[PDB]
Amino acid sequence: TIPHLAIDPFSLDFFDDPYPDQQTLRDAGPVVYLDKWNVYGVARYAEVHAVLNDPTTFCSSRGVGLSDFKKEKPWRPPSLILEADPPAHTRPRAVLSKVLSPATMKTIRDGFAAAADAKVDELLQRGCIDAIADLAEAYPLSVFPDAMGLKQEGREHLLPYAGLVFNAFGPPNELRQTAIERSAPHQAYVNEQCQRPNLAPGGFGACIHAFTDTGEITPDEAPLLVRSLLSAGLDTTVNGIGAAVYCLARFPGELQRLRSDPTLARNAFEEAVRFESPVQTFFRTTTREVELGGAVIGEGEKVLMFLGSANRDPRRWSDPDLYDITRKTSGHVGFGSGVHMCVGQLVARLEGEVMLSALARKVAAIDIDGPVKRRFNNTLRGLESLPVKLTPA
Ligand code: HEM
Ligand SMILES: O=C(O)c1ccc(-n2cncn2)cc1
Ligand SMILES: [Cl-]
């Protein structure tokens, strides 16, 4: 009843160009079985959205990677928010929601915007730059560690640690095994910065620790919740901003529309998140036998969701393979959906918006002018190098 496919969604060939195989996964059926890894797969929007929104049946506390925490030891202590289900999830979630709240965005917007404008001005002086190292990486590195309250020393550990986190959601392939092999120094740095004395006043980290006297979290929970922001909040924005620049570089007509109305900046970024989906996949584990899209899945089974595929499913989107900065993007699953829907989405959108605003106001053309190189990760989609010439407006 359920079709069995040999596609390996964690192979380099798949990362290099996932879209044909994603159509094969959607068109094979609402639910497939991936023989390579002994997991169920769902690649259509409807079932991805259904799974995300039934956290009781499709739980997160047995891990959102391939590994089942009921069978194997997690490679690091479980996340108190990502790898927890209601009700344990609920209070740590509320703390992070308040730390990264609508009201908090007002305190950081001016500095984030000024840093975005300054970076674009700097890049225009060079003309030919690498939109990954010099922009997608450099801009978040210039604002987010400081917003966290991190010291300057050791920040070179942050992107490697995040890449490790996202590789570790994958199967035990070479990408994952190599990441874990190299991890000890990055884990040591990150765990230490999570302790209250090492987080500067007024930053996100200190604000998490300040919530430990409300009864929502205890003091021994705060370091792991700081760990969550350092895990989830940098590399993702790098790939999101990188995707947006890549889209504007490939679709000059949309850059021209964005220049003509810079208030489209926020939706241009949201559309980039739909179109490239920086977080491509992740897993749930069934807690009972369940019927999903006409198929029966047993208890204790890993289910792999394809967020990027759901965001390109023609059953849900008109012209899904077009980058359209005026698209009604509401409902895309690039930030997830439901109780775990990205708690840092307002920080992500703020960064993306202010960067695309700076480009909209200051740049007349973005032309790829060198070899484009992809960056391979078991969970994240993004580029390693994006050589572009920026022409000033
Ligand atoms: C473009 C940037 C980003 C993308 C594409 C993205 C994507 C996602 C997705 C898909 C999830 C859901 C995972 C799941 O349901 O298992 C998630 C959760 C999460 N994200 Fe993001 N994210 C981004 C930025 C950020 C930022 C900036 C932060 C923090 C500053 C952050 C922190 C988190 C946390 C803590 C969770 C877990 C929330 C929970 O489990 O309730 N993310 N993110
Ligand atoms: O709590 C953490 O450590 C954490 C939270 C979320 C994620 N993400 C997974 N997919 C997208 N974000 C990774 C780590
Ligand atoms: Cl760690």
CA of 279 to the centre of ligand 2 (A): 10
Q: Does residue 243 line the site of ligand 1, with CB under 6 A?
A: no
Protein residue whose Cα sits closest to atom 9 of ligand 2 = 232
Of 217, 238, 208, the closest CA to residue 100 belongs to: 208
Residues in Cβ contact with 56 at an 8 Å cutoff, skipping those fewer than 6 apart? 85, 86, 287
Q: Does residue 242 line the site of ligand 1, with CB under 6 A?
A: no
Please state the atom number of ligand 1 nearest to the C-alpha of residue 282. 16
Protein residue whose Cα sits closest to atom 12 of ligand 2 = 232
Please state the atom number of ligand 1 nearest to the C-alpha of residue 241. 1
Ion ligand 3: residues, CB within 5 A, are: 76, 187
| Among the bound ligands, the one closest to the CA of 346 | 1
Please state the atom number of ligand 1 nearest to the C-alpha of residue 144. 30
Q: For residues 275 and 320, what is the distance between their CA atoms, to the nearest angstrom?
A: 8
| Among the bound ligands, the one closest to the CA of 228 | 2
Annotate the chain with three-state secondary structure. CCCEECCCCCCHHHHHCCHHHHHHHHHHCCCEEECCCCEEEECCHHHHHHHHCCCCCEECCCCCCCCCCCCCCCCCCCCCCCCCCCCCCHHHHHHHHHHCCHHHHHHHHHHHHHHHHHHHHHHHHHCEEECHHHHHHHHHHHHHHHHHCCCCCCHHHHHHHHHHHHHHCCCCCHHHHHHHHCCHHHHHHHHHHCCHHHCCCCCHHHHHHHHHHCCCCCHHHHHHHHHHHHHHCCHHHHHHHHHHHHHHHHCHHHHHHHHHCHHHHHHHHHHHHHHHCCECEEEEEECCCEEECCEEECCCCEEEEEHHHHCCCCCCCCCCCCCCCCCCCCCCCCCCCCCCCCCCHHHHHHHHHHHHHHHHHHEEEEEECCCCEEEECCCEEEEEECEEEEEEC
**To one decimal place, what's the resolution in Å?**
1.5
- Give the count of beta carbons closer than 10 Å to the beta carbon of residue 101: 14
Please state the atom number of ligand 2 nearest to the C-alpha of residue 80. 1
Please state the atom number of ligand 1 nearest to the C-alpha of residue 340. 41
| Among the bound ligands, the one closest to the CA of 339 | 1
CA of 3 to the centre of ligand 2 (A): 30
Mutate to test the pocket of ligand 2, among 95, 158, 228, 335 (most ligand atoms within 8 A of CB): 228
CA of 187 to the centre of ligand 3 (A): 4
Instruction: Tell whether 342 is in a known binding site.
Output: yes
Protein residue whose Cα sits closest to atom 26 of ligand 1 = 233
Structure determination technique employed: X-ray
Q: Does residue 51 line the site of ligand 1, with CB under 6 A?
A: no
302-306 and 39-42 beta bridge pairing: parallel
Q: For residues 148 and 257, what is the distance between their CA atoms, to the nearest angstrom?
A: 34
Pocket lining for ligand 2, CB < 6 angstroms: 79, 81-82, 165, 227-228, 231-232, 279, 282
Residues in Cβ contact with 44 at an 8 Å cutoff, skipping those fewer than 6 apart? 26, 30, 293, 309, 310, 313, 315, 316
Protein residue whose Cα sits closest to atom 36 of ligand 1 = 342
CA of 169 to the centre of ligand 2 (A): 10
Whole-number Cα distances in Å, 347 to 17, 49, 147, 208, 261 = 29, 23, 10, 16, 22
Instruction: Tell whether 340 is in a known binding site.
Output: yes
Mutate to test the pocket of ligand 1, among 165, 225, 342, 353 (most ligand atoms within 8 A of CB): 342
32-34 and 4-5 beta bridge pairing: parallel
